[PDB]
Write a protein that binds this ligand. Sequence first.
Ligand SMILES: Nc1ncnc2c1ncn2[C@@H]1O[C@H](COP(=O)(O)OP(=O)(O)O)[C@@H](O)[C@H]1O
Ligand SMILES: Nc1ncnc2c1ncn2[C@@H]1O[C@H](COP(=O)(O)OP(=O)(O)O)[C@@H](O)[C@H]1O
Lengths: 398, 398
Amino acid sequence: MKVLVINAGSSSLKYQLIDMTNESALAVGLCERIGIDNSIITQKKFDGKKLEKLTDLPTHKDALEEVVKALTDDEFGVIKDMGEINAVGHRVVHGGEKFTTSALYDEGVEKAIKDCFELAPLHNPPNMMGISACAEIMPGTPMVIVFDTAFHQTMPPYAYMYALPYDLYEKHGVRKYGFHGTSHKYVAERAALMLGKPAEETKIITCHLGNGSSITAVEGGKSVETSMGFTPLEGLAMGTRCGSIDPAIVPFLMEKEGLTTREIDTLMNKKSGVLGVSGLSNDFRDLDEAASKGNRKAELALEIFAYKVKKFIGEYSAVLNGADAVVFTAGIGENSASIRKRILTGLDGIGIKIDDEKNKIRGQEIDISTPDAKVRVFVIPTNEELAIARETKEIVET
Amino acid sequence: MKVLVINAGSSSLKYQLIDMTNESALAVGLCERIGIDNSIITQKKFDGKKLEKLTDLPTHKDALEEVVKALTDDEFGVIKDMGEINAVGHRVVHGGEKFTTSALYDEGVEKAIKDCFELAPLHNPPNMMGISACAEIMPGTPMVIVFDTAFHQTMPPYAYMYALPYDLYEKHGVRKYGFHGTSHKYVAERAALMLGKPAEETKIITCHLGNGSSITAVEGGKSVETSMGFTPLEGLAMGTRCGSIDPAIVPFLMEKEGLTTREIDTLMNKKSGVLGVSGLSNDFRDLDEAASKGNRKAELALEIFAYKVKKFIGEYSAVLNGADAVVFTAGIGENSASIRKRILTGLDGIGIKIDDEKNKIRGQEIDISTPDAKVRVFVIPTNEELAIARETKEIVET
Ligand SMILES: Nc1ncnc2c1ncn2[C@@H]1O[C@H](COP(=O)(O)OP(=O)(O)O)[C@@H](O)[C@H]1O
Ligand SMILES: Nc1ncnc2c1ncn2[C@@H]1O[C@H](COP(=O)(O)OP(=O)(O)O)[C@@H](O)[C@H]1O
């Protein structure tokens, strides 16, 4: 089965055609400057052939029509006709409580998606232009919407409910949702394979450490607890987000600094995290160098960041009653040997011990723990597009 | 030297008269329903004699006047006249940045306590009322203030700093302080004795579970991390407090419901916790009974509460790199075998296993873990009053 994965932006459209037989990306592409002048589509075919075409792309529908032409090109394409695309997949952030699994697209899902957004306190609404264009160009092809909140819908009530007045949950839907679902589910699946046990028999803690960061406790293949909550702000300190602070600090700051609700929200989401502490950057690479060159604020920001991840590993070890493995993924998790070191030092007491040399390897699924450690520590690159395609294939199959 | 220890709440006042010659509690008492109807003072003398008086107590000053009359009663009292009270030690929750060690009461201490009213809204006002009541009733007696925050001053910067813009820490003193210090320090000491090791060699997790609840990670006798923060609101779900929720919920609620900063603070401190979830009570005894009789909201509130304590045990196990013991104290911690059961179930994976029969014993320092468990679980009655009296003696003596 071949799956086309679409990711649409205001004036762009990224795509990948993936063969699910071998999970190989046959072609990867990008349409830019849509609705602008000098539109362009660029496609890379697996064997090192690149196609570029300067043509006008007024709307996402035009871009998608070109994408199909580029995929079927005699020499630079990978399929003979549009009919070889068995399904299309798209990722949306919030599915609230309406979406407990990925969904087959139709007029119903389009409305539910819009509602989930207007009820949620999220910033950027979902971009539907890619999804819409798809319905016109390929009416007969199954389309699957994948939600980042979906994977966490298996959480029990004592985990997702906040200790707030119950009516707020009922009147405004306030509860923990969780994000990065697609990433957590994918690496949890890879980790089970590396443990050599069927997923149902595994207990895994997954750490998606990127500009946004979240940890999930995966029991027997299902999410049972996660660090982000009602919004992506809860939990860990991140690039520009403060994470879980004393809630009383909010009105205190609003009275002291004379701030509006929008200002305090912006302060917590964009001026906090390691950026806010370091006074320097929200980029962990920059902080790491700065810290070595002796920059104290940068050193403090990385200490706070690693310390909080360490604590969550302890927290989810209790949730899971002993974990079989801890997984690191995303930008920081996959690439930073030093940040992994800061996080994993001082945990032998709970069965975690790593090998400094194995921890230096990069871009690979690898167990970096000593062979005698009770808890395995795996570094597993997350692959967004492939995860979305697997989700799409599962739905289109069943 | 005889020290009177006072702990004042909104409508109550606990006291103990302790002889420092041998550290014996001569009399223990409680004034309840102050400022309400059917006020009552109850006193227990060391020889078992109990006094109860139904009288009207309009203000803390009236209650304190009765306390003195009960302490001097010919048969049920323990001293001949007020002059036998050499000093008074007061429990005060927040002293802010300026006061983080015990202090002889003076104009400056008073100022700091009133300035922190907004930082400990449920506590500082009543603590102040008890101090003023004491100044009027016994003008000539030395008064010593002992802060809930002192014990946590050993926390490292990466634990007490929030991932917020650094200037807020500098300009407004925003950082984690922690509370119940006196209780945590005392039971940590008792736990080291029970482990038969020098405090310096121990790693203990102390859980003070009462109307207010907090956990502390004690390493070698020093507090290294604790659950409450800038204010007593952070951390666990409590009787009427929500604990650590997604901070984004604050601005969100303010906008949806049109709430000012004062109202949202009251909502989080007075209408949340198990009271907010259950819709029934903030008393764990009542919830336990209601849960057993089939009340779902009450059952959910206790699950959320126990689950959060369980997670903190995991969190601090990582902080401490393996703990030697977990300690339960305060109202719920000392008396609820069933709540301890909910909390401690499913942790054998991290070395914690308890004996259901031992867990039924009450009012005793006892190890309730199975003999083979790697981590000991002790139930230890707290004695904040003897600890406050020790400080009072030291300060008044020098
Ligand atoms: N080698 C590295 N060392 C430290 N940090 C890195 C490294 N590589 C990437 N990062 C960090 O990872 C983040 C980008 O990762 P990414 O997975 O794309 O984030 P997100 O999941 O939030 O979209 C940035 O904050 C960046 O500084
Ligand atoms: N046997 C019990 N079972 C469950 N909860 C209890 C029990 N005894 C006391 N509690 C709870 O403990 C809390 C008492 O709070 P605390 O701060 O320790 O003060 P106090 O020592 O004055 O009772 C109350 O919420 C109360 O309902």
